[PDB]
Symmetry: C3
Subunit: 422 residues, 3 copies
């Protein structure tokens, strides 16, 4: 039934490629926490999955936060007297500080310098900067290109707008047999950078695309929203729905060649933590698990004391990686096998969530005479521990065995009627 | 009082020898899960301890199981045209597959070969095979002897019977001051092999023989029954008695030169687990402790969810050892010091079970002025932790001290009336 | 507020010197469990802090103990025929066994020898011996000096008295906002030895001296009493006060050049254990933590089952150190930086005890938009874990961060009204 997910896991190599192509299509667009770039991004996503798109008015109070003004940008450049655009937004949108106020000026190098940003230690990288909440403006460039700049009169143009508007977020909901809900979120505010965070956006899109085709026990909600402000906005508009969210994962940085990393929920041993660590344990690659900390991505909002949901984060090279928030986080930094593997892992997690049943041994008094009914070690564990209190995940953990081994053992026993679902 | 066990522990070397002699006497007899071999074995045991012998009719439903037909064997052989018994049951009863249907045939080597069994990797071993529940027949032989066999017409004789009869089990019960019961079980179905399982049979016999002579707090029951089918049969006939079984041990593989191994109860930290690991910890030899798993010996039946007793297994080289289920598990594989040591350890376990009291310090407000009443570190622990909630085993564990040190410290304090038994 | 303790911690080097000078002043006085030496010691202490001095009559029943006779000593010596005091109390009070009955005799070397005590393994040390509860007398001397002694007639004089009198103990109480009480005890019965225990006496004096000048939340009691008999006497006279003692520390051996050692309370994870281990963890030096054992110093009386308070012991080189109970434990064995460091650590412990508050995040629904109100990682932890159930110590532990970092983060949040004290 959910065994239908197996073909998706088996074709993950090909899907890693499709996930990459979506990243490549999204790459050039200038996202921020608001704006037409976010809207162009939602359009592209809706070529793959349905979404309901929400627009929350600037000035709307979302718990302690206020929905900001909307920002947009047509062009930006620093041009020299010889006419050459020595900095050009059209070449890389990381060249402009996100939320830059509009500017049109002539300035000398010395007057421009304070608004220029480089990375001296990596003379070839463009730094990514933002200024969402204090009015400001900036240009980023490589140190190497900075070092070649002259004393001169430069035309400085940032053709932007910062006006009351609205904040875009997208949402897709799959109704399962049950209202209990698994939440998968990712953030849409980063512009032309790949691991952080076109990888999460493209991954969650394809997970949604696969789940759409299956009959699930749980309901699944997929949130695409700007980081921090988006999740706060969503929570402020959905307090009624929180009681059903059983578990969740924030997807980001899921595309590079490195090993998988799992950040636990604030509780450390919630069902989702136990499920994800059990999948990693038996997956055959290296991985690393970290405890919760109240910074990083939107798991901070979901794990606030007043929200208090079980949300972790399954990543590859976690944010902080070398080149993050710079132009080094580009298309060639994406790895197809990495994307394939992250997608496969998420699907295995979902398969585990769905098939984590609890059973009662219908012949608890000594073992049954296996043979009256037509992997024996797994079976003996399932019979032995199915007192009504142990889940298959519990048995997989105590036995040290892989989850599917336990599951298939339980299937076989259920067929010969030695188990009742409870 | 139970201090009377000390002389038995001190004479364990001599007893290891007596335990060996019982093994040697039992060795030649052809046991199976039923049959006259089991009966001859119960006769020999009753030369040492009393037993009540039970016979359960073939076809009796014992929980999900059915008591099998009774199997017996007079002779078996493969004879060549020259008249030579190239396989001879009288030389080793491992040469016949247990429960072999009777056969009387002439066959060529090629027709015989499929019913012949060897161990290619150990060209000198006879494999032990059984076929309790599907009708069948087989001969085991060494690969080396197989390799010397000719194309020929062979007379093939297995003079056996497989008929409705009854299943034998033996039982000995010692009444203590209390009905709470310690259960010690071993299995009687293996033929001419020593570690698995004449060692458990001879050991438990001698433990019973020693306990018989002592005034015990607990009641003790000793079960001698075929593996699996015997324990299921016993449980099916004694549901009324299960509420009193406080703890138990299955004895097998207790006779070789290797280190001691303890398999825990399914609960992992039951009183018996804590007691056995505390004895091993301070015993002065190497040992290994394993967690429960629902296969191996009869602890699977006792640990079924519907029975759910605390039964572990104290062994030497656990089943799976090199040569197990083969003719290599012979008399020379038994080691007297091993048998002596296993017996000593079981007695120390029993001494601990019996003397694990709980006391109340009658002078809890500061330490007493020791000197008003005529190993001080042990004493201070006993006084300090005897609030009515801590057992001597608890104190031995927290103090890191050996159990007898704590016990004797508690004795001395009880004498000067600084402790109340509670 | 308690931030006023910071200047005392910052001036600890100078205070280590003052603590040393008190030790030096106290060093020559002949303390025992009773006597005028204890009284001279209380006089000197009262030059630094107020004390209430108690005198409990010999023969008074203090729980199971009896207050002993009072012992005093004017002079003691062994003199040879040539007139030379070959042993002289005036040179070192360790030369006389504490509680020595008075003696005035002429004896030959062979008759004297059984009452002489040396340390053969450290031919230059005077052993410290006592005989509080059986009547007796002895002289201690170096092996080297013993080896130079002649066959001779020696005048043997111990000018002492052992008569019904009273047992002295001193006590100082600081009333805090709350009656809940922190108890700091030290023992006054050791004569001319420094680490054991003029160091505890001088340290606790200076802690009392500093706390006296601060407005504390908790009440603080400082007990100066002979070991064992003194604490039992105090407990027997203050059962009514025990319900308020939240935590406590016994100070001894706090003056040498070695690393800090913490002995835990019998509970192992009481608030005081958690506080002291958290201070050590981040203090920047090596340390060692030990579990409770019911011997050593007065934590045995406080941790009796009938008293059952949370009292640990924060030391440097714990009793048992090389030279302990000998003349090697002298002034040069005291280290100023050691004394300074022990005092600083005790003050940091007290600062932690006082500032370990519990708060409620007043904006629990998602993080606040920090910026509406004017070390961010610490702050995010405090906001995230302040659900009303977590103390700052809890947050410091879970975050792995140093306690003051958490405290100051909590201060800042409290100021902008994002936290309620609960
Ligand atoms: Cl939808
Ligand atoms: Cl497995
Ligand atoms: Cl009987
Ligand atoms: Cl010990
Ligand atoms: Cl006072
Ligand atoms: Cl820190
Ligand atoms: Zn980022
Ligand atoms: Zn076997
Ligand atoms: Zn001492």
């Amino acid at each position: 039934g959910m065994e239908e997910i197996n073909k998706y896991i088996q074709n993950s190599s090909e899907t890693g490629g499709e996930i990459y192509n979506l990243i490549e299509e999204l790459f050039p667009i200038c996202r921020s926490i608001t704006g037409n770039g976010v809207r162009k991004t939602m359009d592209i996503i809706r070529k793959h999955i349905p979404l309901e798109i929400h627009e929350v008015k600037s000035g709307t109070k979302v718990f302690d936060w206020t929905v900001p003004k909307e920002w947009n940008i047509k062009d930006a450049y620093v041009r020299n007297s010889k006419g050459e655009k020595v900095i050009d937004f059209k070449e890389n949108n990381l060249h402009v500080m996100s939320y830059s106020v509009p500017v049109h000026k002539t300035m000398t190098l010395d007057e421009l310098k304070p608004y220029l940003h480089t990375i001296p230690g990596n003379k070839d990288r463009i730094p990514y900067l933002t200024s969402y909440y204090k009015e400001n403006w900036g240009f980023s460039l490589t140190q190497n290109k900075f070092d070649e700049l002259c004393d001169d009169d430069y035309e400085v143009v940032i053709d932007s707008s910062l006006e009351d508007g609205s904040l875009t977020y997208g949402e897709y909901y799959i109704r399962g047999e049950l209202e209990e809900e698994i939440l998968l979120t990712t953030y849409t505010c980063h512009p032309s950078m790949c691991n952080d965070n076109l990888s999460g956006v493209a991954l969650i899109t394809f997970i949604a695309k696969a789940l759409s085709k299956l009959k699930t026990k749980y309901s699944y909600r997929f949130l695409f929203a700007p980081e921090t402000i988006g999740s706060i906005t969503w929570l402020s508009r959905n307090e009624d729905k929180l009681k059903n969210i059983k578990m969740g994962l924030v997807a980001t940085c899921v595309g590079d060649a490195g090993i998988k990393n799992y950040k636990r929920t604030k509780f450390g041993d919630a069902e989702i933590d136990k499920i994800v660590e059990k999948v990693l344990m038996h997956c055959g690659s290296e991985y690393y698990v970290a405890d919760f900390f109240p910074w990083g991505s939107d798991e901070r909002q979901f794990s606030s004391p007043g929200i208090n949901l079980s949300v972790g984060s399954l990543m590859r090279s976690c944010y902080g990686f070398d080149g993050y928030h710079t132009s080094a986080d580009n298309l060639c930094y994406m790895n197809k096998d990495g994307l394939a593997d992250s997608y496969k892992t998420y699907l295995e997690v979902i398969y585990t969530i769905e098939n984590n049943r609890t059973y009662l041994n219908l012949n608890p008094k000594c073992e049954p005479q296996l043979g009256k009914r037509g992997d024996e070690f797994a079976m003996f564990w399932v019979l032995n521990m199915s007192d009504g209190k142990n889940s298959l995940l519990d048995i997989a953990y105590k036995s040290g065995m892989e989850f599917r081994r336990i599951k298939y053992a339980a299937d076989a026993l259920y067929r010969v009627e030695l188990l009742k679902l409870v």
